[PDB]
From Swiss-Prot:
InterPro entries (UniProt xref): AAA_dom, DNA_Partitioning_ATPase, P-loop_NTPase
Organism of origin: Gloeothece citriformis (strain PCC 7424)
Binding site for ATP 1: G19, G20, Q21, G22, K23, T24, T25, Q48, F190, L224, E225, S226, Y229
Stated name of the protein: Maintenance of carboxysome distribution protein A
Signal peptide: none
Keywords: ATP-binding, Carbon dioxide fixation, Cytoplasm, DNA-binding, Hydrolase, Nucleotide-binding, Plasmid
Pfam family, one: AAA_31
Presence of keyword Hydrolase: yes
Reactions catalysed, as given in the entry: ATP + H2O = ADP + phosphate + H(+)
Residues under site feature: McdA subfamily signature lysine residue: K159
EC number: 3.6.4.-
BP GO terms, sorted: carbon fixation
Record note on domains: Has an adenine-nucleotide sandwich dimer structure in common with ParA ATPases. Nucleotide-binding forces changes that create an ATP-binding pocket.
Function: McdA and McdB together mediate carboxysome (Cb) spacing, size, ultrastructure and probably inheritance in the cell, together they prevent Cb aggregation. McdA is an ATPase that forms dynamic gradients on the nucleoid in response to adapter protein McdB, which associates with carboxysomes. The interplay between McdA gradients on the nucleoid and McdB-bound carboxysomes result in the equal spacing of Cbs along the cell length.
Length: 259
């Protein structure tokens, strides 16, 4: 049973055209951090289902997940599961989430299907954090449509700059069509390589080119390349709890920009 409150749930989406463990990382640590003093709803919109795994949830056989919520086969709240933490909940994903592609496309309003599905939950949480799939897919675009704020991780590399660009053009076209009504929180570069005191010229350049391509956008302190992210993720804890609080700073920065 879900306790309703005075809350008007603010939906944040971590979206980026290309394949990146950057979104899932950013969704995990950012959600966990928001849940310190707020009620947070995680949505795992990637058919790879990592966020669901990292948050330590397993989907039982006849259990309704995101797929069932998208296809209107179940009340929204029946796809919301409680987590270990008392402030964190999860609309999971497993195997067949990709069957949502056909359903969404053929509906003729894919990009706003999820936005609709989640309205009912508006009063029950303070935040919704969506980890979107690593492609242009129907789903990909339904998450963007659902967003009040959009956060775009981008690899500090040429591939990352090109992905930032394709993502902004996808967003713009959804805005023109009326699907995307939110604003863009900013870009958060990731896999930024440093060699002690000097950063990789390649990373410095990509990040410099991000500010050029999108001078209107805010570019957050970046996520250093580091195995720690994967280590904490694996044991389901924050980076500060693992012992490396500096790495947590760029996520703190994002939290502070939502308040």
């Amino acid at each position: 049973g879900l306790v309703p409150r005075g809350s008007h749930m603010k939906t944040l989406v971590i979206a980026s055209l290309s394949g990146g463990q950057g979104k899932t990382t950013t969704a995990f640590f950012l959600g966990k951090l928001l849940s310190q003093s707020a009620k947070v709803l995680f949505i795992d919109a990637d058919p790879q289902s990592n966020l669901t795994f990292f948050l330590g949830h397993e989907v039982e056989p006849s259990a309704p997940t995101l797929l069932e919520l998208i296809k209107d086969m179940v009340e929204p709240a029946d796809a919301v599961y409680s987590l270990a933490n008392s402030n964190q909940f999860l609309i999971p994903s497993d195997d067949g989430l990709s069957n949502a592609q056909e359903y969404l496309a053929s509906s003729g309003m894919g990009a706003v299907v999820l936005k609709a599905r989640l309205k009912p939950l508006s009063e029950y949480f303070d935040y919704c954090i969506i980890d979107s799939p690593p492609a242009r897919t129907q789903i990909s675009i339904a998450t963007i449509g659902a967003a009040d704020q959009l956060l775009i991780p981008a690899e500090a590399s040429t591939k990352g700059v090109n992905s930032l660009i394709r993502t902004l053009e996808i967003v713009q076209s959804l805005e023109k069509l009326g699907a995307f009504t939110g604003s863009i929180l900013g870009v958060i570069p990731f896999r930024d390589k440093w060699f002690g005191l000097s950063q990789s010229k390649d990373s410095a350049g990509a990040i410099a080119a991000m500010k050029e391509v999108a001078p209107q956008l805010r570019i957050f302190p970046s996520i250093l390349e580091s195995e720690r992210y994967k280590q904490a993720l694996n044991q389901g804890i924050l980076l500060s709890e693992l012992g490396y609080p500096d790495l947590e700073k760029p996520f703190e920065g994002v939290k502070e920009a939502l308040g």
